[PDB]
Amino acid sequence: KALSAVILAAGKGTRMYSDLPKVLHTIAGKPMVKHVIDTAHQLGSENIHLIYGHGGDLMRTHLANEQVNWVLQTEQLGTAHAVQQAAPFFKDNENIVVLYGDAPLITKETLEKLIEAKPENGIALLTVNLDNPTGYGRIIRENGNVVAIVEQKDANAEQLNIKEVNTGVMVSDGASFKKWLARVGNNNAQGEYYLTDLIALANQDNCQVVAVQATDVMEVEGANNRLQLAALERYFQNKQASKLLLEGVMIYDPARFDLRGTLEHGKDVEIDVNVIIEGNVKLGDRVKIGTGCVLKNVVIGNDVEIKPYSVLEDSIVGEKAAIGPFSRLRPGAELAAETHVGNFVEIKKSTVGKGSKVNHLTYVGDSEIGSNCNIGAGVITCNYDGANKFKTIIGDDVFVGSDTQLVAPVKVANGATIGAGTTITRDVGENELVITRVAQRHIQGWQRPI
Amino acid sequence: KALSAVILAAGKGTRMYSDLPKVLHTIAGKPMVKHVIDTAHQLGSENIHLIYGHGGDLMRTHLANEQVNWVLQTEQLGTAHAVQQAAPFFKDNENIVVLYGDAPLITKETLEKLIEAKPENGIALLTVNLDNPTGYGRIIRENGNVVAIVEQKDANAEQLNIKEVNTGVMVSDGASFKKWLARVGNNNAQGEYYLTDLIALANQDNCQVVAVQATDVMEVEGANNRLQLAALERYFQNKQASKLLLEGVMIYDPARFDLRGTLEHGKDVEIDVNVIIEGNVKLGDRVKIGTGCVLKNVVIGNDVEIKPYSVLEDSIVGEKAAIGPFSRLRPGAELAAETHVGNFVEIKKSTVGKGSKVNHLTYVGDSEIGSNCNIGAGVITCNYDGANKFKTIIGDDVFVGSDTQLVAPVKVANGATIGAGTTITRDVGENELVITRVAQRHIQGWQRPI
Amino acid sequence: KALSAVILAAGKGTRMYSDLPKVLHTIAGKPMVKHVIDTAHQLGSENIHLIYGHGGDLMRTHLANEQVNWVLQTEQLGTAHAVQQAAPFFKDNENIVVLYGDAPLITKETLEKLIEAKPENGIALLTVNLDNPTGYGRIIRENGNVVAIVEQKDANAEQLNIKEVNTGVMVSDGASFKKWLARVGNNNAQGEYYLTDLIALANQDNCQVVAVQATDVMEVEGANNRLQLAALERYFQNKQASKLLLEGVMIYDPARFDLRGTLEHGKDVEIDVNVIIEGNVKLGDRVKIGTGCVLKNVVIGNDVEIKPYSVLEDSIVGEKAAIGPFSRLRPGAELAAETHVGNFVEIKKSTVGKGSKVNHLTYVGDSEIGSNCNIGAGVITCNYDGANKFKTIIGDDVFVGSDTQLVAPVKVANGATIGAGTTITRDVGENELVITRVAQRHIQGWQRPI
Ligand SMILES: O=c1ccn([C@@H]2O[C@H](COP(=O)(O)OP(=O)(O)O)[C@@H](O)[C@H]2O)c(=O)[nH]1
Ligand SMILES: O=c1ccn([C@@H]2O[C@H](COP(=O)(O)OP(=O)(O)O)[C@@H](O)[C@H]2O)c(=O)[nH]1
Ligand SMILES: O=c1ccn([C@@H]2O[C@H](COP(=O)(O)OP(=O)(O)O)[C@@H](O)[C@H]2O)c(=O)[nH]1
How far apart CA B365 and CA C170 sit, in angstroms, is 68
Give the CATH number for residue C88: 3.90.550.10
User: Which of A100, A181, A186, A220 is the pocket-test mutation for ligand 1 (most atoms within 8 Å of CB)?
Assistant: A100
B219 annotated to bind ligand: no
Task: Give the count of beta carbons closer than 10 Å to the beta carbon of residue A93.
Answer: 10
Angle at B261 between CA B259 and CA B263, to 5 degrees: 70
Cα A26 to Cα A16, A75, A233, B10, B283: the distances in Å are: 12, 25, 9, 50, 21
Tell me, yes or no, if C360 is annotated catalytic. yes
Residue among C248, C253, C402 minimizing CB distance to B380: C402
Chain C residue at shortest CA distance from B16: C248
Is residue C311 domain-shared with residue C383, that is, in the same domain?
yes
| Residue B372 in contact with partner chain A when CB distance is under 8 A | no
Cβ neighbors of A55 (< 8 A, separation 6 or more) are A12, A19, A20, A21, A24
Query: Of ligand 3's atoms, which has the minimum distance to the CA of residue C77?
Result: 1
Judge if the beta carbon of residue C82 lies within 6 A of ligand 3.
yes
Q: What is the dihedral of CA B218, B224, B230, B234, to 10 degrees?
A: 10
Instruction: Supply the angle between the helices C79-86 and C174-181 in degrees, to the nearest 10.
Output: 130
Give the CATH number for residue A234: 2.160.10.10
Is residue A215 domain-shared with residue A299, that is, in the same domain?
no
- The answer to whether A286 and A303 have CB atoms below 8 angstroms apart is yes
- The answer to whether B250 and B267 have CB atoms below 8 angstroms apart is no
Is residue C219 domain-shared with residue C238, that is, in the same domain?
no
Strand stretches in C82-154, DSSP E: 95-100, 123-129, 138-142, 145-150
Chain C residue at shortest CA distance from A422: C423
**Closest alpha carbon to C96 in C161, C47, C51:** C47
Estimate to the nearest angstrom the gap between the alpha carbon of C422 and the chain centroid. 45
On the 0-12 / 13-18 / 19+ scale of CB atoms within 10 A, B255 is middle
Is residue C31 domain-shared with residue C159, that is, in the same domain?
yes
Q: Please spell the DSSP secondary structure of A6-18, one letter per residue.
A: EEE-----GGG-S
Is residue C13 domain-shared with residue C109, that is, in the same domain?
yes
How far apart CA A394 and CA C194 sit, in angstroms, is 67
Say yes or no for a CB contact (<8 Å) between A252 and C274.
no
Q: Which pairing describes strands A123-129 and A164-173: parallel, antiparallel, or unpaired?
A: antiparallel
Estimate to the nearest angstrom the gap between the alpha carbon of A431 and the chain centroid. 49
Instruction: Supply the angle between the helices C32-43 and C108-117 in degrees, to the nearest 10.
Output: 50
Estimate to the nearest angstrom the gap between the alpha carbon of A352 and the chain centroid. 29
Is residue A204 domain-shared with residue A283, that is, in the same domain?
no
Q: Whose CA is nearest to atom 22 of ligand 2?
A: B11
Q: How was this structure determined?
A: X-ray
The sign of the dihedral angle between the CA atoms of A415, A419, A424, A429 is negative
Q: Which pairing describes strands A417-418 and A433-436: parallel, antiparallel, or unpaired?
A: parallel
- The answer to whether C427 and C391 have CB atoms below 8 angstroms apart is no
Q: A447: helix, coil or strand?
A: coil
Q: Which pairing describes strands C367-369 and C392-394: parallel, antiparallel, or unpaired?
A: parallel
C383 annotated to bind ligand: yes
Query: Of ligand 1's atoms, which has the minimum distance to the CA of residue A76?
Result: 1
Helix (H) or strand (E) holding C342: strand C340-348
Q: Which pairing describes strands B380-382 and B145-150: parallel, antiparallel, or unpaired?
A: unpaired
Strand stretches in A270-310, DSSP E: 270-271, 275-283, 288-289, 294-300, 305-306
Is residue A179 domain-shared with residue A280, that is, in the same domain?
no
| Proportion of chain A in helix, strand, coil states, percent, rounded to 5 | 20, 35, 45
**Closest alpha carbon to B256 in B223, B304, B213, B293:** B293
Helix (H) or strand (E) holding C405: strand C405-407
Cβ neighbors of A309 (< 8 A, separation 6 or more) are A290, A291, A292, A293, A324, A325, A326, B292, B309, C292, C309, C311
- The answer to whether B29 and B70 have CB atoms below 8 angstroms apart is no
Q: Which pairing describes strands B367-369 and B380-382: parallel, antiparallel, or unpaired?
A: unpaired
The sign of the dihedral angle between the CA atoms of B89, B94, B95, B101 is negative
How far apart CA A360 and CA C30 sit, in angstroms, is 31
How far apart CA A140 and CA A280 sit, in angstroms, is 46
Q: Which pairing describes strands C440-443 and A357-365: parallel, antiparallel, or unpaired?
A: unpaired
- The answer to whether A326 and A341 have CB atoms below 8 angstroms apart is no
How far apart CA B253 and CA A91 sit, in angstroms, is 43
| Proportion of chain C in helix, strand, coil states, percent, rounded to 5 | 20, 35, 45
Rg of chain A on CA atoms, in Å: 31
Instruction: List the beta bridge partners of residue B360.
Output: B343
- The answer to whether C223 and C242 have CB atoms below 8 angstroms apart is no
Is residue C82 domain-shared with residue C119, that is, in the same domain?
yes
Is residue C280 domain-shared with residue C309, that is, in the same domain?
yes
Rg of chain B on CA atoms, in Å: 31
- The answer to whether C348 and C367 have CB atoms below 8 angstroms apart is no
Among the candidates B207, B224, B241, a domain finishes at B224
Say yes or no for a CB contact (<8 Å) between A225 and B246.
yes
How far apart CA C37 and CA C8 sit, in angstroms, is 11
Helix (H) or strand (E) holding A170: strand A164-173
Cβ neighbors of A314 (< 8 A, separation 6 or more) are A296, A297, A298, A330, A331, A332, A333
How far apart CA A125 and CA A113 sit, in angstroms, is 11
Helix (H) or strand (E) holding C177: helix C174-181
- The answer to whether B269 and B275 have CB atoms below 8 angstroms apart is no
Judge if the beta carbon of residue C85 lies within 6 A of ligand 3.
no
Cβ neighbors of A178 (< 8 A, separation 6 or more) are A87, A90, A92
Is residue B407 domain-shared with residue B276, that is, in the same domain?
yes
Q: Which pairing describes strands B311-317 and B294-300: parallel, antiparallel, or unpaired?
A: parallel
Give chain A's domain count.
2
Say yes or no for a CB contact (<8 Å) between B397 and C448.
yes
Mind spelling out the 3-state secondary structure of chain B?
CCEEEEEECCCCCHHHCCCCCHHHCEECCEEHHHHHHHHHHHHCCCCEEEEEECEHHHHHHHCCCCCCEEEECCCCCCHHHHHHHHHHHCCCCCEEEEEECCCCCCCHHHHHHHHHHCCCCCEEEEEEECCCCCCCCEEEEECCEEEEEECCCCCCCCCCCCCEEEEEEEEEEHHHHHHHHCCCCCCCCCCCCCHHHHHHHHHHCCCCEEEEECCCHHHHCCCCCHHHHHHHHHHHHHHHHHHHHHCCCEECCHHHEEEEEEEEECCCCEECCCEEEEEEEEECCCCEECCCCEEEEEEECCCCEECCCCEEEEEEECCCCEECCCEEECCCCEECCCCEEEEEEEEECCEECCCCEEEEEEEEECEEECCCCEECCCCEEECCCCCCCCCEEECCCCEECCCCEEECCEEECCCCEECCCCEECCCECCCCEEEECCCEEEECCCCCCC
The sign of the dihedral angle between the CA atoms of A406, A410, A413, A419 is negative
Task: Give the count of beta carbons closer than 10 Å to the beta carbon of residue B112.
Answer: 12
Q: C195: helix, coil or strand?
A: helix
> Phi/psi class of residue C357: alpha, beta or left (left: φ > 0; alpha: ψ in -120 to 50)?
beta
**Closest alpha carbon to A367 in A410, A337, A327, A417:** A410
How far apart CA A446 and CA A430 sit, in angstroms, is 44
Is residue C204 domain-shared with residue C232, that is, in the same domain?
no
Helix (H) or strand (E) holding C361: strand C357-365
How far apart CA A268 and CA A285 sit, in angstroms, is 6
Ligand nearest to the CA of B21: 2
Cβ neighbors of B237 (< 8 A, separation 6 or more) are B28, B254, B257, B258, B259
How far apart CA B79 and CA C86 sit, in angstroms, is 64
- The answer to whether B260 and C275 have CB atoms below 8 angstroms apart is no
How far apart CA C12 and CA B34 sit, in angstroms, is 57
Angle at C285 between CA C282 and CA C286, to 5 degrees: 115
Is residue A233 domain-shared with residue A141, that is, in the same domain?
no
Among the candidates B196, B224, B252, a domain finishes at B224
How far apart CA A427 and CA A414 sit, in angstroms, is 12
Q: Which one of the listed residues B25, B265, B360, B442 is annotated catalytic?
A: B360
How far apart CA C422 and CA B150 sit, in angstroms, is 81
Residue among B311, B405, B435 minimizing CB distance to C325: B311
B78 annotated to bind ligand: yes
Among the candidates C224, C251, C275, a domain finishes at C224
On the 0-12 / 13-18 / 19+ scale of CB atoms within 10 A, B179 is middle
Estimate to the nearest angstrom the gap between the alpha carbon of A56 and the chain centroid. 22
Alpha helices in A141-296 (DSSP H): 174-181, 198-204, 226-246
Judge if the beta carbon of residue A10 lies within 6 A of ligand 1.
yes
**Closest alpha carbon to B271 in B231, B244, B301:** B244
The sign of the dihedral angle between the CA atoms of A126, A128, A134, A139 is positive
**Closest alpha carbon to A85 in A77, C409, A161, A260:** A77
Distance from CA of A7 to the nearest CA of C (A): 35
On the 0-12 / 13-18 / 19+ scale of CB atoms within 10 A, B120 is exposed
Say yes or no for a CB contact (<8 Å) between A407 and B420.
yes
Q: What is the dihedral of CA B407, B412, B417, B420, to 10 degrees?
A: 10
Alpha helices in C363-415 (DSSP H): none
By residue range, what is the domain housing residue B187?
1-224
On the 0-12 / 13-18 / 19+ scale of CB atoms within 10 A, C209 is buried
How far apart CA B272 and CA B289 sit, in angstroms, is 6
How far apart CA A276 and CA A328 sit, in angstroms, is 15
Cβ neighbors of C450 (< 8 A, separation 6 or more) are none
Instruction: List the beta bridge partners of residue C348.
Output: C365
> Phi/psi class of residue C29: alpha, beta or left (left: φ > 0; alpha: ψ in -120 to 50)?
left
Helix (H) or strand (E) holding C230: helix C226-246
Task: Give the count of beta carbons closer than 10 Å to the beta carbon of residue B46.
Answer: 11
Exposure of A274 in the CB half-sphere (CA atoms within 13 A): 33
Cα C330 to Cα A52, B360, C333: the distances in Å are: 57, 23, 6
Instruction: Supply the angle between the helices B108-117 and B32-43 in degrees, to the nearest 10.
Output: 50
Distance from CA of B372 to the nearest CA of A (A): 13
* B308 prior amide bond cis, ω within 30: no
Judge if the beta carbon of residue B51 lies within 6 A of ligand 2.
yes
Residue A363: list chain B partners with CB under 8 A. Answer: 360-361, 377-378
C78 annotated to bind ligand: yes
**Closest alpha carbon to C328 in B330, B293, A327:** A327
Distance from CA of C423 to the nearest CA of A (A): 7
Helix (H) or strand (E) holding C322: strand C322-323
Distance from CA of A398 to the nearest CA of B (A): 9
Angle at C386 between CA C385 and CA C389, to 5 degrees: 95
How far apart CA B74 and CA B72 sit, in angstroms, is 6
Angle at A433 between CA B433 and CA A442, to 5 degrees: 60
Query: Of ligand 2's atoms, which has the minimum distance to the CA of residue B75?
Result: 1
**Closest alpha carbon to C95 in C40, C52, C23:** C40
Estimate to the nearest angstrom the gap between the alpha carbon of B411 and the chain centroid. 41
Q: What is the dihedral of CA B204, B208, B213, B217, to 10 degrees?
A: -30
Q: Whose CA is nearest to atom 16 of ligand 2?
A: B11
Ligand nearest to the CA of B6: 2
Ligand nearest to the CA of B195: 2
* A409 prior amide bond cis, ω within 30: yes
In the chain, the amino acid numbered C279 is G
Q: C204: helix, coil or strand?
A: helix
How far apart CA B240 and CA A314 sit, in angstroms, is 36
* C409 prior amide bond cis, ω within 30: yes
C window 302-331, beta carbon within 8 A of B: 308-309, 325-326
Estimate to the nearest angstrom the gap between the alpha carbon of C233 and the chain centroid. 11
Task: Give the count of beta carbons closer than 10 Å to the beta carbon of residue A247.
Answer: 15
Estimate to the nearest angstrom the gap between the alpha carbon of B167 and the chain centroid. 26
How far apart CA A202 and CA A197 sit, in angstroms, is 9
How far apart CA B270 and CA B285 sit, in angstroms, is 10
- The answer to whether C165 and C136 have CB atoms below 8 angstroms apart is yes
Q: What is the distance in A from the centroid of ligand 3 to the CA of C8?
A: 7
Interface test with C, best of B382, B389, B394 (most C CBs within 10 A): B382
**Closest alpha carbon to A326 in A345, A298, A348, A350:** A345
**Closest alpha carbon to C324 in C348, C360, C283:** C360
Q: A293: helix, coil or strand?
A: coil
In the chain, the amino acid numbered C286 is R
Task: Give the count of beta carbons closer than 10 Å to the beta carbon of residue C360.
Answer: 27
**Closest alpha carbon to B378 in B361, B358, B357:** B361
